[PDB]
Amino acid sequence: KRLFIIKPSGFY
Amino acid sequence: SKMELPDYKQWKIEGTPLETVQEKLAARGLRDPWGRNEAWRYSGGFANNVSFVGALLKGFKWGFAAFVVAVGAEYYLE
Amino acid sequence: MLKIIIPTTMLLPMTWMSKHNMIWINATVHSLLISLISLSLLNQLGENSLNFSLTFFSDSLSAPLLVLTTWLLPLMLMASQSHLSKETTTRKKLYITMLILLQLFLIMTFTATELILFYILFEATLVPTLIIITRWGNQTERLNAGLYFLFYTLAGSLPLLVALVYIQNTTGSLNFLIIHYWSHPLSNSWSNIFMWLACIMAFMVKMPLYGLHLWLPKAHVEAPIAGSMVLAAVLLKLGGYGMMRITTILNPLTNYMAYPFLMLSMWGMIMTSSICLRQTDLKSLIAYSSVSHMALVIVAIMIQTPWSFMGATALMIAHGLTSSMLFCLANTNYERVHSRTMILARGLQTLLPLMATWWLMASLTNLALPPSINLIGELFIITASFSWSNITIILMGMNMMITALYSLYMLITTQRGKYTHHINNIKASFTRENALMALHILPLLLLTLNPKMILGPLY
Amino acid sequence: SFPKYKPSRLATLPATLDPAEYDISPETRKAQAERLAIRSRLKREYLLQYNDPNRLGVIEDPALIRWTYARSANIYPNFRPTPKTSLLGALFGIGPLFFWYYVFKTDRDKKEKLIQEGKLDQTFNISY
Amino acid sequence: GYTPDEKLRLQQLRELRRRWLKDQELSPREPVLPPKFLQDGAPWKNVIYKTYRHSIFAVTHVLIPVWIIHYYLKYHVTAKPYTVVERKPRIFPGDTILETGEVIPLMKEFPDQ
Amino acid sequence: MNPFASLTLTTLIILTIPIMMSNSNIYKTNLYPNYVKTTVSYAFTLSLVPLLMFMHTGQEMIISNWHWMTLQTVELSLSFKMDYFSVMFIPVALFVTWSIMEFSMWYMHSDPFINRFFKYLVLFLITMMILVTANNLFQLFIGWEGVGIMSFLLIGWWHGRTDANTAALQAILYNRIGDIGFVLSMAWFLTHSNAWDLQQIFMLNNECPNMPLIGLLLAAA
Amino acid sequence: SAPAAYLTHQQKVLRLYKRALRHLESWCVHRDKYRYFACLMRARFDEHKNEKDMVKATQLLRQAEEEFWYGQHPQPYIFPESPGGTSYERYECYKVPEWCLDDWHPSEKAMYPDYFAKREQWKRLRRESWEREVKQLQEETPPGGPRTEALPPARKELWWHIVTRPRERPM
Amino acid sequence: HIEPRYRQFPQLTRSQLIQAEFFSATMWFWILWRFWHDSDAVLGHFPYPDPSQWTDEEL
Amino acid sequence: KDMFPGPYPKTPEERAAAAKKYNMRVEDYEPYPDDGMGYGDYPKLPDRSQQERDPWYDWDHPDLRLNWGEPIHWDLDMYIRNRVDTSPTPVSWNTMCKHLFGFVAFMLFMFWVGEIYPSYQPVGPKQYPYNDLYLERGGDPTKEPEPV
Amino acid sequence: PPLTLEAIKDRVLYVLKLYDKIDPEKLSVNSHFMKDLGLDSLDQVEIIMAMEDEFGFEIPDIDAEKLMCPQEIVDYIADKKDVYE
Ligand SMILES: CCCCCCCCCCCCCCCCC[C@@H](O)O[C@H](CO[C@H](O)CCCCCCCCCCCCCCC)COP(=O)(O)OCC[N+](C)(C)C
């Protein structure tokens, strides 16, 4: 996309 | 894709109600530097306030007519 | 049953002989299995109390509790098994023995049957929980805490003991069934009144009463979580079980002696809940919430109306699960940041979501909203209380106010809001954590579908 | 204008109206210089703590610990018997519960006299 | 009136921050692992979504529940008394379909409007 | 009659399904919400029908498909009375809420977690349906309180700013103060009328109830 | 962003001015009337004692504060970013601190090779830098006065704090 | 699809104004058609003093 | 360490150690004082809900809004915001109380005097106009016992 | 409006131009505010509040004290809006 969002890892 | 800014020069204050205010300050002799800014964008362009009751009757001019068509249908049913 | 009880003993050899790094799996798996075996007991009967050996029986009042008690061991294991790691193998292997030995005493002390056997186990539970609070609790105060946990039980229990012996001399057998049948009223005088308090005070200590609850918070502040889950979810409830047992005697005197304790309880509930509204640190907040709910049980027992015992049973179990749930759910934070104080956690939701969901479910059933078994458990006893005195509602209502507030409060203060900046310590939620609390909360929700098996004997 | 604001425990006066805000002497200016001094001291400290790579973990400020300590462990050791606290404690203590004692007991007696000596007993109330 | 050192400080930090935000931007960096994936992709090979999507969607969400719940209707209503209690229809002067009957009354009323 | 019966219960139950779909991967997709607006759309379309069978012939219905817990004497059971009120009211809620769906798709179109937002919407509405429909008083209480807590989840949506949180807590607080009165009444009908059902209570209370009505009034407040 | 300093008279009267002027808009609503009374107001501040001895002046303030406080209006207009705000922290749900990403584990970290690359570049820059800010802070500082921060002189300048704040509307 | 301007507000699409005007007109058309369809603001006359012969008084 | 709060105000020369200990040497140190409530040697701080402290300042803990080592008000939690807010109000407190309580008073008394004089009954003077209807009586005599 | 630095400097000057006390030809992005131009603080408050008002953005007071050079202003909004353009 255009810009990088931050966000906690949602993998676990 | 930037839009251009319009113009510094073009915002006349003379047509504004604010000009009357600057006159009233002239009666005090006081200076009101900001008016050409404040009045420009707002009062001085598109601005031309719609009447209240006139705003309330926004649809009446057509509605009364379609209504005439309706009562015309009433007599037509007769 | 004698069938469920043997394997529970049998895990001990299995624990000791287990390979040094596999023990958790052993104890976990078999504890789960034995839970499922415990579940078959639940059947009961609609009329006669179920019976077994001469020395055990299984009233409907005991069965859901028994199922619960069997159910908790794996949970405490899942909580514990990362809390400790650096400990030596022999010491760990020594440690789970405390837990299982403990539940063994519970499975024995619920099925009773002689009230002297029931007593001696009732008090026998005291040792392992003491050892656990004292050796594996953190910070200094735990030492002192041990003492408060201890004498308050004994100072209560000891007179009860002498009283028990007395009765089996003034009447025939001490056994529960016949005494349920041979029961005859005791009345006024003065000797009989001291008999009354002698047969009540221990039970009313072990489930904290408002004038006497002081040890309980100071136990929960200290104990390692495996001690906390039991000390909250179970022992209180068993004190309630016994008090529901011994009320087969007494009467009509209960009609005359209930009042003072109904005042300490009806007032202590609003009071402790009020203190609950302003704690410094979470681990205590939960504890006072627990007392604030147990007061409801104790009036529910003393008004002695059948609705009140139904509500008694339900609320005992529901509060069991929800309280244990809040405790593990708090320990997680305490491990992630070692803060203990609630103010430091701050914006924990921002940094991780699913725990916020468990906070939501858990607190949500703490306040008790429909159709949680907590709620339905509570509404009955408000009904019977209201029958007992039309005024009483004005007290109960205030409870239902404050239990909302602080409950939501613990949610909104330790979650919603800004993250603290420098606290880098948090590390994104282990599988065992989610597994654990899912294990608390799912049974609690399925259980609402089929209350009729939890309401107990006076159903 | 005329009316003048009147400060109260729940409505502390705005700083702009405080007389102390105006009258000002060089030593008091030393007070503000001091306050900025210690405040700058501690905040400089907190920044030295806040952001060097090696800390990783949390760093609790001592004041908060003094507070949490003083909300619990330090209350009893001090105490002191004082008649104001003692009487106030007897009051909040035994008082209201005696109050509820009479308030329930009378109603109980009233239902007694109606159920028995009277006959105003409820019907249908078979649930119990 | 800023002190000059403050000025250079704010300048330096401004530059560094724009450098940061510029660093934040991503390019073709957005990515994904290959993606049962076939369990979805195979089904989409033949679907005509413009009408069929509404088809299957409506099929589930309105057709299944009513079949099911009505079957549950034959269960609970046929099984037990008082599972369903009608208001019972108002019956005017006109004859009932149950067995004719019924009659108008008097009609002594007079005048109109 | 029977078609009316299956009809209303369907005009409720289908609302439940998207929440169930919440664990399905479609929920994680951007695609989810329009299935919800469509869902309420079908729900409305279905919802009109009972109103019309209600129209020209005027019939009304109660169903109580499953007793939940048989106590002594009292046996509370879920029971969907479908009188004038409950039938007339549903299409309204479905209608306006459907419009709110379509609105919200645009109002929030920037927002992350929007899918969760819709989940909370449907989750709210269904509780509202629990309240409008319920005959048995206790079921009215679950609808009651559940609507309260949904109000809490939505008021606090922008959980960052404190003011949202205080607002949420404030709302739950005053609702609770009402709930005291609700419980007072709810007990009193059981102690006296022995009921928790509108049939029972309407039947047995020709006599003046001096007090339950006022606490129930407070709950209404 | 320019901390402290024990307060002085001039800036004081100024803030009173911006304040009073703003509440004055809150009353006058229309751009018109507001303009007029605004000019009248500044006209009051100059027409009064635009120059004077201090001891009178403070008294003039004590007058002004009252005269304002009476007229201050039950609620001023407030821009949403401001502490009143219709959205003072609507987005604080989102502004996750950067160190948290530093946790995603490789199956996620692989998906943004570029961003992570640049990021280790940064983190390297910091861990390399830090001792210099140590020595400099140690240097420029006296025992430790009211002032916060200190100028760059050859590199870096306590930057990691501000420079890597998570912008304003992350989502 | 729309541009910011800085005073002009390029009020896009006539269709918008067509809609707005359409509903305002739809409104008045309804209120008037209903006004002619009936005058619900009135119905039947009422009175007070009536006649003493209808009641009673004698002397 | 010794950092923990220490008993009793009564340290007239040793008070300096206390004022230092909480980081507030400027003789702002305010014991509550000696009293039986048992909280001693802790700074008494002016009441101030956290809204009162400046929002625009860059606090270490902006939600708490109270930097670092700065000693904390005893009842922090009651003033923590989301709780009591003792922010100053343009109209004075007592005036607040008087206007509202008086308002509710007038509202009630006017109400009940209203209750004394129902429509189509009223005070007799106005009732000379207000009288009407009666009207209500009706129904077949059966309805008197159709309801019975 | 994703916004850019040129848009900021342009809109800012575009407001400074309209203020009467400034003579538009003398205005420059780097043009100083007191040492150049005699506007004084009592008008400085006007230009700053009127200028933030254009954006709807809010100016904290201590930051309002600096201000002065228009470049310092465009820098300031550049920081608060985080434009990085
Ligand atoms: C379950 C909830 C519990 C509620 C609270 C429990 C009990 C609280 C009440 C405590 C009872 C009285 C003890 C209080 C202290 C009295 C002893 C002494 O310490 O108090 C002195 C001062 O206290 C008063 O003198 C005593 C007032 C006691 C009156 C309260 C009694 C209320 C009745 C409570 C019920 C009693 C139980 C009955 C059974 C139901 C201070 O000592 P001292 O400083 O050196 O000398 C006096 C200084 N002078 C000369 C300057 C005055």
PDB file of N, CA and C in Angstrom, chain F residues 41-90:
ATOM      1  N   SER F  41     -31.548  -6.683   5.871  1.00  0.00           N
ATOM      2  CA  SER F  41     -32.495  -6.402   4.801  1.00  0.00           C
ATOM      3  C   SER F  41     -33.459  -7.566   4.643  1.00  0.00           C
ATOM      4  N   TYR F  42     -32.904  -8.768   4.530  1.00  0.00           N
ATOM      5  CA  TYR F  42     -33.731  -9.955   4.421  1.00  0.00           C
ATOM      6  C   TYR F  42     -34.568 -10.096   5.664  1.00  0.00           C
ATOM      7  N   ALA F  43     -33.991  -9.703   6.790  1.00  0.00           N
ATOM      8  CA  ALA F  43     -34.688  -9.820   8.051  1.00  0.00           C
ATOM      9  C   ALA F  43     -35.926  -8.955   8.036  1.00  0.00           C
ATOM     10  N   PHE F  44     -35.828  -7.799   7.402  1.00  0.00           N
ATOM     11  CA  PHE F  44     -36.959  -6.897   7.340  1.00  0.00           C
ATOM     12  C   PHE F  44     -37.992  -7.430   6.381  1.00  0.00           C
ATOM     13  N   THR F  45     -37.501  -7.906   5.243  1.00  0.00           N
ATOM     14  CA  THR F  45     -38.374  -8.402   4.202  1.00  0.00           C
ATOM     15  C   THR F  45     -39.235  -9.495   4.778  1.00  0.00           C
ATOM     16  N   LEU F  46     -38.598 -10.369   5.537  1.00  0.00           N
ATOM     17  CA  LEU F  46     -39.306 -11.411   6.235  1.00  0.00           C
ATOM     18  C   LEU F  46     -40.192 -10.818   7.317  1.00  0.00           C
ATOM     19  N   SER F  47     -39.734  -9.718   7.902  1.00  0.00           N
ATOM     20  CA  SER F  47     -40.401  -9.128   9.053  1.00  0.00           C
ATOM     21  C   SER F  47     -41.744  -8.514   8.756  1.00  0.00           C
ATOM     22  N   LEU F  48     -41.959  -8.103   7.515  1.00  0.00           N
ATOM     23  CA  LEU F  48     -43.242  -7.506   7.170  1.00  0.00           C
ATOM     24  C   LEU F  48     -44.398  -8.481   7.257  1.00  0.00           C
ATOM     25  N   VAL F  49     -44.127  -9.724   6.893  1.00  0.00           N
ATOM     26  CA  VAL F  49     -45.173 -10.716   6.716  1.00  0.00           C
ATOM     27  C   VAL F  49     -46.048 -10.937   7.956  1.00  0.00           C
ATOM     28  N   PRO F  50     -45.429 -11.139   9.131  1.00  0.00           N
ATOM     29  CA  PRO F  50     -46.282 -11.335  10.300  1.00  0.00           C
ATOM     30  C   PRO F  50     -47.188 -10.159  10.537  1.00  0.00           C
ATOM     31  N   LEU F  51     -46.728  -8.963  10.198  1.00  0.00           N
ATOM     32  CA  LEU F  51     -47.534  -7.786  10.433  1.00  0.00           C
ATOM     33  C   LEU F  51     -48.798  -7.814   9.592  1.00  0.00           C
ATOM     34  N   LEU F  52     -48.693  -8.349   8.382  1.00  0.00           N
ATOM     35  CA  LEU F  52     -49.846  -8.414   7.496  1.00  0.00           C
ATOM     36  C   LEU F  52     -50.787  -9.527   7.879  1.00  0.00           C
ATOM     37  N   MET F  53     -50.248 -10.678   8.266  1.00  0.00           N
ATOM     38  CA  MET F  53     -51.138 -11.714   8.770  1.00  0.00           C
ATOM     39  C   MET F  53     -51.807 -11.191  10.027  1.00  0.00           C
ATOM     40  N   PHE F  54     -51.107 -10.308  10.720  1.00  0.00           N
ATOM     41  CA  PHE F  54     -51.674  -9.606  11.852  1.00  0.00           C
ATOM     42  C   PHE F  54     -52.719  -8.595  11.427  1.00  0.00           C
ATOM     43  N   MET F  55     -52.647  -8.133  10.188  1.00  0.00           N
ATOM     44  CA  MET F  55     -53.535  -7.059   9.779  1.00  0.00           C
ATOM     45  C   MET F  55     -54.985  -7.479   9.665  1.00  0.00           C
ATOM     46  N   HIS F  56     -55.349  -7.980   8.492  1.00  0.00           N
ATOM     47  CA  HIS F  56     -56.747  -8.146   8.133  1.00  0.00           C
ATOM     48  C   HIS F  56     -57.516  -9.086   9.048  1.00  0.00           C
ATOM     49  N   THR F  57     -56.850 -10.101   9.588  1.00  0.00           N
ATOM     50  CA  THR F  57     -57.543 -11.017  10.482  1.00  0.00           C
ATOM     51  C   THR F  57     -57.254 -10.732  11.955  1.00  0.00           C
ATOM     52  N   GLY F  58     -56.126 -10.087  12.242  1.00  0.00           N
ATOM     53  CA  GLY F  58     -55.857  -9.594  13.583  1.00  0.00           C
ATOM     54  C   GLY F  58     -55.372 -10.569  14.639  1.00  0.00           C
ATOM     55  N   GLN F  59     -54.968 -11.767  14.235  1.00  0.00           N
ATOM     56  CA  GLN F  59     -54.555 -12.790  15.194  1.00  0.00           C
ATOM     57  C   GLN F  59     -53.268 -12.442  15.939  1.00  0.00           C
ATOM     58  N   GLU F  60     -53.143 -12.949  17.163  1.00  0.00           N
ATOM     59  CA  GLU F  60     -51.935 -12.783  17.961  1.00  0.00           C
ATOM     60  C   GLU F  60     -51.546 -14.090  18.630  1.00  0.00           C
ATOM     61  N   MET F  61     -50.273 -14.207  18.979  1.00  0.00           N
ATOM     62  CA  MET F  61     -49.698 -15.490  19.349  1.00  0.00           C
ATOM     63  C   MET F  61     -48.684 -15.405  20.468  1.00  0.00           C
ATOM     64  N   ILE F  62     -48.627 -16.453  21.277  1.00  0.00           N
ATOM     65  CA  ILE F  62     -47.528 -16.666  22.201  1.00  0.00           C
ATOM     66  C   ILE F  62     -46.919 -18.032  21.968  1.00  0.00           C
ATOM     67  N   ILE F  63     -45.597 -18.124  21.984  1.00  0.00           N
ATOM     68  CA  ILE F  63     -45.000 -19.440  21.963  1.00  0.00           C
ATOM     69  C   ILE F  63     -43.956 -19.486  23.053  1.00  0.00           C
ATOM     70  N   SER F  64     -43.767 -20.670  23.610  1.00  0.00           N
ATOM     71  CA  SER F  64     -42.772 -20.897  24.635  1.00  0.00           C
ATOM     72  C   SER F  64     -42.165 -22.239  24.339  1.00  0.00           C
ATOM     73  N   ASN F  65     -41.268 -22.263  23.364  1.00  0.00           N
ATOM     74  CA  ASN F  65     -40.844 -23.515  22.770  1.00  0.00           C
ATOM     75  C   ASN F  65     -40.157 -24.463  23.736  1.00  0.00           C
ATOM     76  N   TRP F  66     -39.501 -23.920  24.752  1.00  0.00           N
ATOM     77  CA  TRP F  66     -38.690 -24.767  25.614  1.00  0.00           C
ATOM     78  C   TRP F  66     -38.518 -24.273  27.030  1.00  0.00           C
ATOM     79  N   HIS F  67     -39.064 -25.032  27.976  1.00  0.00           N
ATOM     80  CA  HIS F  67     -38.872 -24.732  29.382  1.00  0.00           C
ATOM     81  C   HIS F  67     -37.399 -24.872  29.697  1.00  0.00           C
ATOM     82  N   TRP F  68     -36.898 -23.977  30.531  1.00  0.00           N
ATOM     83  CA  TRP F  68     -35.468 -23.871  30.739  1.00  0.00           C
ATOM     84  C   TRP F  68     -35.024 -24.410  32.074  1.00  0.00           C
ATOM     85  N   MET F  69     -35.925 -24.404  33.045  1.00  0.00           N
ATOM     86  CA  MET F  69     -35.562 -24.791  34.396  1.00  0.00           C
ATOM     87  C   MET F  69     -36.788 -24.914  35.277  1.00  0.00           C
ATOM     88  N   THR F  70     -37.236 -26.140  35.497  1.00  0.00           N
ATOM     89  CA  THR F  70     -38.501 -26.365  36.175  1.00  0.00           C
ATOM     90  C   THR F  70     -38.336 -26.383  37.678  1.00  0.00           C
ATOM     91  N   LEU F  71     -38.663 -25.275  38.321  1.00  0.00           N
ATOM     92  CA  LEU F  71     -38.622 -25.219  39.772  1.00  0.00           C
ATOM     93  C   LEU F  71     -39.887 -25.806  40.332  1.00  0.00           C
ATOM     94  N   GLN F  72     -39.963 -25.878  41.648  1.00  0.00           N
ATOM     95  CA  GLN F  72     -41.212 -26.234  42.281  1.00  0.00           C
ATOM     96  C   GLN F  72     -42.203 -25.140  41.944  1.00  0.00           C
ATOM     97  N   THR F  73     -43.464 -25.510  41.747  1.00  0.00           N
ATOM     98  CA  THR F  73     -44.504 -24.548  41.414  1.00  0.00           C
ATOM     99  C   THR F  73     -44.132 -23.704  40.203  1.00  0.00           C
ATOM    100  N   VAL F  74     -43.225 -22.759  40.403  1.00  0.00           N
ATOM    101  CA  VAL F  74     -42.757 -21.940  39.307  1.00  0.00           C
ATOM    102  C   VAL F  74     -42.022 -22.798  38.315  1.00  0.00           C
ATOM    103  N   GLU F  75     -42.292 -22.591  37.038  1.00  0.00           N
ATOM    104  CA  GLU F  75     -41.453 -23.155  36.000  1.00  0.00           C
ATOM    105  C   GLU F  75     -41.237 -22.125  34.930  1.00  0.00           C
ATOM    106  N   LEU F  76     -40.188 -21.341  35.083  1.00  0.00           N
ATOM    107  CA  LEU F  76     -39.907 -20.332  34.096  1.00  0.00           C
ATOM    108  C   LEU F  76     -39.409 -20.986  32.823  1.00  0.00           C
ATOM    109  N   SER F  77     -39.748 -20.359  31.706  1.00  0.00           N
ATOM    110  CA  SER F  77     -39.433 -20.858  30.382  1.00  0.00           C
ATOM    111  C   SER F  77     -39.394 -19.680  29.442  1.00  0.00           C
ATOM    112  N   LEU F  78     -38.539 -19.727  28.432  1.00  0.00           N
ATOM    113  CA  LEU F  78     -38.528 -18.639  27.475  1.00  0.00           C
ATOM    114  C   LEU F  78     -39.845 -18.659  26.722  1.00  0.00           C
ATOM    115  N   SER F  79     -40.412 -17.484  26.483  1.00  0.00           N
ATOM    116  CA  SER F  79     -41.710 -17.395  25.836  1.00  0.00           C
ATOM    117  C   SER F  79     -41.856 -16.108  25.059  1.00  0.00           C
ATOM    118  N   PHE F  80     -41.959 -16.237  23.747  1.00  0.00           N
ATOM    119  CA  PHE F  80     -42.058 -15.081  22.883  1.00  0.00           C
ATOM    120  C   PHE F  80     -43.494 -14.673  22.642  1.00  0.00           C
ATOM    121  N   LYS F  81     -44.074 -13.840  23.493  1.00  0.00           N
ATOM    122  CA  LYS F  81     -45.404 -13.366  23.159  1.00  0.00           C
ATOM    123  C   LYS F  81     -45.262 -12.470  21.946  1.00  0.00           C
ATOM    124  N   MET F  82     -46.229 -12.532  21.045  1.00  0.00           N
ATOM    125  CA  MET F  82     -46.166 -11.763  19.816  1.00  0.00           C
ATOM    126  C   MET F  82     -47.419 -10.943  19.653  1.00  0.00           C
ATOM    127  N   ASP F  83     -47.693 -10.074  20.610  1.00  0.00           N
ATOM    128  CA  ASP F  83     -48.939  -9.332  20.579  1.00  0.00           C
ATOM    129  C   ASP F  83     -48.893  -8.242  19.525  1.00  0.00           C
ATOM    130  N   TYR F  84     -49.814  -7.298  19.633  1.00  0.00           N
ATOM    131  CA  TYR F  84     -49.789  -6.112  18.800  1.00  0.00           C
ATOM    132  C   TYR F  84     -48.458  -5.381  18.879  1.00  0.00           C
ATOM    133  N   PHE F  85     -48.001  -5.158  20.100  1.00  0.00           N
ATOM    134  CA  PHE F  85     -46.806  -4.371  20.333  1.00  0.00           C
ATOM    135  C   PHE F  85     -45.588  -5.007  19.699  1.00  0.00           C
ATOM    136  N   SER F  86     -45.359  -6.256  20.060  1.00  0.00           N
ATOM    137  CA  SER F  86     -44.148  -6.937  19.667  1.00  0.00           C
ATOM    138  C   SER F  86     -44.088  -7.194  18.176  1.00  0.00           C
ATOM    139  N   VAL F  87     -45.243  -7.345  17.546  1.00  0.00           N
ATOM    140  CA  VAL F  87     -45.267  -7.566  16.112  1.00  0.00           C
ATOM    141  C   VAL F  87     -45.046  -6.271  15.379  1.00  0.00           C
ATOM    142  N   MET F  88     -45.746  -5.236  15.820  1.00  0.00           N
ATOM    143  CA  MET F  88     -45.644  -3.947  15.166  1.00  0.00           C
ATOM    144  C   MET F  88     -44.255  -3.337  15.295  1.00  0.00           C
ATOM    145  N   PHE F  89     -43.599  -3.586  16.416  1.00  0.00           N
ATOM    146  CA  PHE F  89     -42.380  -2.860  16.713  1.00  0.00           C
ATOM    147  C   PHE F  89     -41.176  -3.343  15.911  1.00  0.00           C
ATOM    148  N   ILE F  90     -41.117  -4.642  15.652  1.00  0.00           N
ATOM    149  CA  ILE F  90     -39.954  -5.243  15.007  1.00  0.00           C
ATOM    150  C   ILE F  90     -39.588  -4.639  13.648  1.00  0.00           C
TER     151      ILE F  90
END
